[PDB]
Amino acid sequence: DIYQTPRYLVIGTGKKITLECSQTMGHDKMYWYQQDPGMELHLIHYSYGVNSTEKGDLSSESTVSRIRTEHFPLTLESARPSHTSQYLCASTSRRGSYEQYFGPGTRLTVTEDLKNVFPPEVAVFEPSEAEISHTQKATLVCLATGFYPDHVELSWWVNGKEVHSGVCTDPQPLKEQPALNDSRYALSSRLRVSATFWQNPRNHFRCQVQFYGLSENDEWTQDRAKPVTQIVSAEAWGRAD
């Protein structure tokens, strides 16, 4: 198959970034695309094979290497805030209808200062009694607030398993201050269950938020907790009422 690492990256301005893309399918043609949230895909680099490197339709400060068939890494020599987006790697088969296969992508954010990086605060809000009385249903709300960058994955967990039915999370996070470039973010989510399911005290509800931040390699001189990759969580139990 086709692979990309890291899934997420937050880095300071001026530092070197390498994005890994590999595949063992024996494909010759490889691509690098760039895409901002809500925008169209822009081809940035392509490759015919083992020792080929051609520029895409959009100009970039990034270079690519193809010393081997298996590897097509992207290199950002000095990062700038404007490099912030999703980078997607692709390969096409030499056989059949020549299908194109996309890697899982790398979401990169270049911040001016690594002290702009904050993990989410996570809070769960219990179902309204008026909703229960009116609908025979109960909606829990989860809020993840004040996180930077927007490298976050929210999930609901009921009794230790992840739930997908009855859930809606915002497609994109809100900006706390839409005026700033390194503004912090807020995300909302909903889980709706039946009133009888909520009213059972044995039922346990947890909102989990996987945050992607600094690594053990990154330096931290500030007093606050280092904003590492972590899960910040909040929970609630079924109410007897």
């Binding site: 392509y46 809000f125 609908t135 607030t145 909903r190």
Partner: protein, 202 residues
Amino acid sequence: NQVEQSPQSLIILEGKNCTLQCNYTVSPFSNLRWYKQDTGRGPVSLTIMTFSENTKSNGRYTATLDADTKQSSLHITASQLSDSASYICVVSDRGSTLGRLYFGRGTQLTVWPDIQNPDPAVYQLRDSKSSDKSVCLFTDFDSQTNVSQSKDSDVYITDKCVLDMRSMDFKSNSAVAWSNKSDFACANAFNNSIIPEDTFFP
């Protein structure tokens, strides 16, 4: 752009059919592909068609190709909420190594829930008290309702989100609003929005 798509975007109700168009000027022509791209995800290949084939089927997706008029149609049968995505038309000129892929700009398809029994209401969600926020939930309105942003920078309002309780066979919209200020109350939270006249305020 050598590849053009129509419409730019469209909104349909779940259960309905829709057709998306693609027109190209790419010469020479080898194959045409349709991609589905979900939000925050890479595109997924749906149908690849060479000039030799006029039809290709992938479940509920059926692609059509007329290589003479350089046109393709993608038909979605009995649309579903999960069909909400960007649909890309991509064209190849050669099947050899020297070939190239041309990407259309995409069509944004939104599929709405068919809400038969709208019960619009604004609820207050009892604070965790571990948090200083107060949360209001605008819910159970039909998809015709638009949720506006607040006129206060200390008030946050998230757009309508479709929730799907597959068991009860029940779908519902909702919008979340929160603030830290003592001013904030659920009666005025969605004041900037045009809400149904019969909205329940407990």
